[PDB]
Every structure is written in C-alpha cells, then in structure tokens.
Amino acid sequence: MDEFEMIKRNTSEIISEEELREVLKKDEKSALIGFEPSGKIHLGHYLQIKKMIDLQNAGFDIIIVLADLHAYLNQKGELDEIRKIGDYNKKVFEAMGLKAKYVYGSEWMLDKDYTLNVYRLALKTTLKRARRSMELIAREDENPKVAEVIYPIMQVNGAHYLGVDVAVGGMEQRKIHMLARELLPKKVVCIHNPVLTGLDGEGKMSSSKGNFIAVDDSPEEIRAKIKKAYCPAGVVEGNPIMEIAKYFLEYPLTIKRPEKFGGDLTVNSYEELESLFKNKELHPMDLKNAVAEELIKILEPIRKRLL
Numbered sequence: 001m002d003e004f005e006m007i008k009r010n011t012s013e014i015i016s017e018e019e020l021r022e023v024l025k026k027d028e029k030s031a032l033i034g035f036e037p038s039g040k041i042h043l044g045h046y047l048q049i050k051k052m053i054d055l056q057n058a059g060f061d062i063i064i065v066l067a068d069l070h071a072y073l074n075q076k077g078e079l080d081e082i083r084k085i086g087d088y089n090k091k092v093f094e095a096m097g098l099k100a101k102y103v104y105g106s107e108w109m110l111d112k113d114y115t116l117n118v119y120r121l122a123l124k125t126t127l128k129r130a131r132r133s134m135e136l137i138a139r140e141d142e143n144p145k146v147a148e149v150i151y152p153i154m155q156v157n158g159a160h161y162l163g164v165d166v167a168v169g170g171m172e173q174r175k176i177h178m179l180a181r182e183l184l185p186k187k188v189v190c191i192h193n194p195v196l197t198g199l200d201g202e203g204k205m206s207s208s209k210g211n212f213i214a215v216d217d218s219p220e221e222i223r224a225k226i227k228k229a230y231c232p233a234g235v236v237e238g239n240p241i242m243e244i245a246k247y248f249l250e251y252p253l254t255i256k257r258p259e260k261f262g263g264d265l266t267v268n269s270y271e272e273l274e275s276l277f278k279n280k281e282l283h284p285m286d287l288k289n290a291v292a293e294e295l296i297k298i299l300e301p302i303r304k305r306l307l
C-alpha cells in the first residue's frame with residue numbers, strides 16, 4: 001500500500017521492494033527477526049521491534065527467534081546461561097507492545113529435519129562466503145573456529161524452516177540475508193534497519209560496549225547517559241541524540257527550555273529539529289533535556305512491566 005510505505009519507513013534497504021509488494025497481496029504472510037540473547041536490551045533492539053509492530057499491523061504473522069544456539073556458536077557463553085538471558089529477552093520484547101510467536105533456537109534448530117537441511121546447505125556454501133557473511137557478526141577470534149561457518153547456514157535455514165515470506169535484521173545481517181537468497185528454494189524478502197550510533201559516537205549501540213540506552217534503564221540512568229553523550233552543536237550525521245529523536249520521538253514536540261535561553265521551541269517534525277540543530281538555533285543541552293524527558297515517557301511502560 002500504504003502498508004508498503006509504513007513498512008519502508010525508517011529502513012536502510014528492502015531486498016527487494018518489488019517482491020515485498022507481491023507478498024503484501026497475499027492473505028497469509030509471515031515475518032521473522034532473530035536476536036542472539038543479550039543481557040541488556042537497548043534502543044537498537046527496540047527500533048527493530050517497532051519495525052515488527054509495523055509488519056504486524058500490516059497483516060504479517062510475527063516470529064521472534066531467541067537465537068540461543070547462534071550466541072552459543074558465537075562464543076557468548078554456556079547454552080543454559082544463554083537460554084536464561086533469552087527468557088529475560090522474551091519478557092522485554094513482550095513489554096515492547098508486539099504480539100508475536102517467540103521461539104528458541106535450541107527447540108527446533110536440533111530437529112533431525114532441520115540438521116539434515118543445514119548439512120545440505122554446508123555442501124552448497126563455500127568457506128569463503130560463510131566467513132565473509134560473518135565479518136560484522138563474529139566475536140573477534142585470533143584462531144577462527146568451525147562454529148563460525150555453521151552460524152550463517154543455521155541462520156539461513158531458520159527462514160526456510162519457519163516458512164517466512166520476510167526476514168528482518170539490521171544492516172550487518174545483509175550478507176547472511178544475501179546467502180539465504182541464494183541457498184533457499186523460496187526467495188525471502190529481506191528488510192534491513194539502520195545501525196544506531198553508540199552514545200559515545202562509536203559506530204554501533206552495543207551491550208558489551210557500554211554506550212547504549214537500555215529499555216529497562218531507570219530515568220536517572222537515561223538522563224546521565226544522555227548528558228555524557230556525543231552531541232556537538234550543529235552536527236546531525238552520526239549524532240546519537242539526533243538519531244533517538246528521529247526514530248523514537250512523536251511529533252509535534254515541545255522543548256521546555258529557559259525563557260532567557262530562547263524561550264520554548266515547539267518542533268513540528270524531526271526535520272524541523274534537524275534544521276534548528278544544524279543552524280545553532282537549538283543548543284545541545286536543550287536538545288539533550290527534551291530527548292531525555294521524552295525517552296523516559298516512551299519506555300515508562302516497558303520499564304514498569306519489568307518489576
């Protein structure tokens with residue numbers, strides 16, 4: 001539609017936009033996203049869930065894969081310890097306002113029929129394509145393990161096992177999604193979300209990096225992290241404060257600032273906040289204060305539920 005544009009909104013690419021339109025014409029449609037369990041669920045994760053919500057509202061049946069086996073394979077720790085992290089993740093996503101079927105990797109990824117197809121894919125996959133597909137995913141290892149090349153082929157097969165019409169991931173999943181489109185009999189539509197900039201300006205919002213706003217973060221933590229964050233005046237590109245404002249805030253918005261500092265600015269859209277920021281009219285402190293307070297209101301239900 002419409003459904004199309006709502007879905008295309010705030011994504012980096014759709015492989016392929018055309019095939020997405022075709023899928024939308026169907027009465028029955030399915031979509032998945034998978035996540036390696038992570039102790040902290042941040043704004044990078046929420047952005048993607050909002051995308052699922054968008055697909056959910058467009059008629060898609062949503063599947064969330066808690067990929068405990070992939071994280072095991074990607075050296076995140078012990079299988080039982082990762083499933084418990086995955087139990088917590090389900091609860092967080094179950095607070096984010098999306099009705100979806102939740103599924104653990106370790107349930108069906110050890111199925112005889114599953115395992116059999118993984119081996120069939122291993123025969124079709126070159127070690128070079130499997131190694132290349134993992135560059136932006138693999139935990140830095142000085143001596144690459146056999147688990148590294150099993151990881152993409154198991155991810156590829158999940159889209160097949162589940163029978164999804166669409167696979168959703170961040171931009172770093174692009175190569176595994178490209179592999180999936182070459183190894184599977186049914187080509188799946190691949191929707192890619194942008195990579196959120198970390199709070200310190202360092203590329204990606206990451207759980208192990210400590211430069212993220214977690215969805216369960218208390219108001220004081222949100223204010224503190226927003227305060228220390230990279231946000232020089234006039235810069236929009238790679239500004240994490242500006243990115244949160246783009247992706248998470250509802251517009252029109254009003255920035256409650258001191259009367260002597262310029263009054264009170266009411267912002268019609270993100271792009272209005274953009275031109276005001278780029279043109280020194282809105283100081284970083286004022287932007288920070290408004291962003292912190294709005295974020296506190298948006299994640300208030302998530303936070304509230306998780307206790």
Ligand SMILES: N#Cc1ccc(C[C@H](N)C(=O)O)cc1
Pocket residue numbers: 032033034035036065067070137154155156157158159169173
């Ligand atoms: N089916 C299926 C499936 C989809 C995604 C993943 C994890 C993914 N590589 C991630 O980084 O989030 C694992 C399994």
